[PDB]
Design an enzyme around this catalytic site. Structure first.
Site, PDB file in Angstrom:
ATOM      1  N   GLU A 133       0.800  -1.243   0.000  1.00 33.94           N
ATOM      2  CA  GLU A 133       0.000   0.000   0.000  1.00 33.94           C
ATOM      3  C   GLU A 133       0.827   1.285   0.000  1.00 33.94           C
ATOM      4  O   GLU A 133       0.433   2.326   0.551  1.00 33.94           O
ATOM      5  CB  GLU A 133      -0.994  -0.009   1.186  1.00 33.94           C
ATOM      6  CG  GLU A 133      -1.931  -1.197   1.168  1.00 33.94           C
ATOM      7  CD  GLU A 133      -2.892  -1.250   2.326  1.00 33.94           C
ATOM      8  OE1 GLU A 133      -2.869  -0.291   3.166  1.00 33.94           O
ATOM      9  OE2 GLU A 133      -3.647  -2.245   2.420  1.00 33.94           O
ATOM     10  N   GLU A 240      -6.577 -10.700  -1.245  1.00 28.84           N
ATOM     11  CA  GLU A 240      -7.420 -10.438  -0.083  1.00 28.84           C
ATOM     12  C   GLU A 240      -8.887 -10.322  -0.514  1.00 28.84           C
ATOM     13  O   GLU A 240      -9.611  -9.479   0.000  1.00 28.84           O
ATOM     14  CB  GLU A 240      -6.976  -9.189   0.688  1.00 28.84           C
ATOM     15  CG  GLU A 240      -5.461  -9.089   0.947  1.00 28.84           C
ATOM     16  CD  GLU A 240      -4.970  -7.931   1.780  1.00 28.84           C
ATOM     17  OE1 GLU A 240      -5.818  -7.241   2.386  1.00 28.84           O
ATOM     18  OE2 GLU A 240      -3.732  -7.727   1.841  1.00 28.84           O
TER      19      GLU A 240
END
Ligand code: NA
Length: 330
Positions: A133, A240
């Site tokens: 991220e 995810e």
């Protein structure tokens, strides 16, 4: 379930099927995991704060239990995650006096963490989310602020990938992120990974978190992102996956069950997504869900604390949902 298809077997020619777990959910959801998955990710216990909570204090016990479970069921393991702006203790960035450390000192601490963790699980963990991220999720800059970036400089990602490669050169190393199919952010992720590969950095894969909703990203957006990232020559993992019953604007807290329309649309959505993943089986090698059944999901408390969400293929009683049947029949 006796006559149910097994997810890992249905997709045996296409990609691994994974689940995020912790020691508690491995016990609560043990038979579903045994019956369906051939990959595991630690939901939280391989994050920095759960492995090195104080400098030189390593707490591998929970991660060790997760790896022991996977290995004893012939499941692969994805390591998650080494360098991230979240769930990293403040000690990491600070000196004795309390001030921020220098670039050189933070690189030594990054190398030591990465080396110690990756070497412990070498030969059991086949891939690592090395950077998580780092790309901005808003605005025009390429990169999100973080202390890693502040103190080291923008080459902090180069260094993290080189340290992880030295620790286990047989691992596949990933850049992992969310909102990965929205075009502006897709172009940032592509540019960043292109620039690292163009320097010879050992980044082998892009992890598409796929924290999706019933409507977003569109199927055309997912297709375009898979093609864009694959055009870099990297491996793709969907890392995810979950399909939230709520759009980002919908912060309702009152719903005590999904509507039939939500359940039906989620089933359609999961069939459409898996059809697309199977179509790109030559570049997608693993699909991990951020859980396995609706009795445990981080979406119950994010982005709204204390509600309930129903994002997965199995319900709270661990029975298949309409989404299961569409996903396995593509
Ligand atoms: Na594949």
């Amino acid at each position: 379930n006796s006559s149910l298809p097994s997810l890992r077997d249905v997709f045996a020619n296409d990609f691994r099927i994974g689940a995020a777990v912790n020691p508690v959910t491995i016990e609560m959801q043990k038979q579903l995991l045994i019956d369906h998955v051939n990959s595991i990710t630690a939901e939280n216990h391989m994050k920095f704060e759960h492995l090195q909570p104080e400098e030189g204090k390593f707490t591998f016990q929970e991660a060790d239990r997760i790896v022991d479970f996977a290995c004893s069921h012939r499941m692969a393991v994805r390591g998650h995650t080494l360098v991230w702006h979240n769930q990293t203790p403040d000690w990491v960035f600070q000196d004795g006096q309390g001030h921020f450390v220098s670039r050189d000192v933070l690189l030594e601490r990054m190398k030591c963490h990465i080396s110690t963790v990756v070497r412990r699980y070498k030969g059991k963990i086949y891939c690592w989310d090395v950077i998580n991220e780092a790309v901005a999720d808003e605005g025009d800059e390429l990169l999100r602020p973080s202390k890693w970036r502040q103190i080291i400089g923008d080459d902090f990602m180069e260094q993290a990938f080189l340290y992880a490669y030295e620790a286990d050169p047989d691992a596949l190393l990933f850049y992992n992120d969310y909102n990965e199919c929205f075009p502006e952010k897709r172009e940032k992720i592509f540019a960043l990974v292109k620039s690292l590969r163009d320097k010879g950095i050992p980044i082998h894969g892009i992890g598409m978190q796929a924290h999706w909703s019933l409507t977003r990203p569109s199927l055309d957006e997912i297709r375009a992102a898979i093609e864009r990232y694959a055009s870099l020559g990297v491996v793709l993992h969907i890392t995810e996956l979950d399909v939230s019953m709520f759009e980002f604007h919908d912060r309702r807290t009152d719903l005590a069950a999904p509507t039939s329309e939500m359940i039906e649309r989620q089933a359609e959505r999961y069939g459409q997504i898996f059809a697309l993943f199977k179509e790109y089986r030559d570049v997608i090698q693993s699909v991990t869900f951020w859980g396995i059944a609706d009795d445990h999901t981080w979406l119950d408390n994010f982005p709204v604390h204390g509600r309930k969400n129903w994002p997965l293929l199995f319900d709270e009683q661990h029975k298949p949902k309409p989404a299961f049947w569409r996903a396995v029949s593509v």
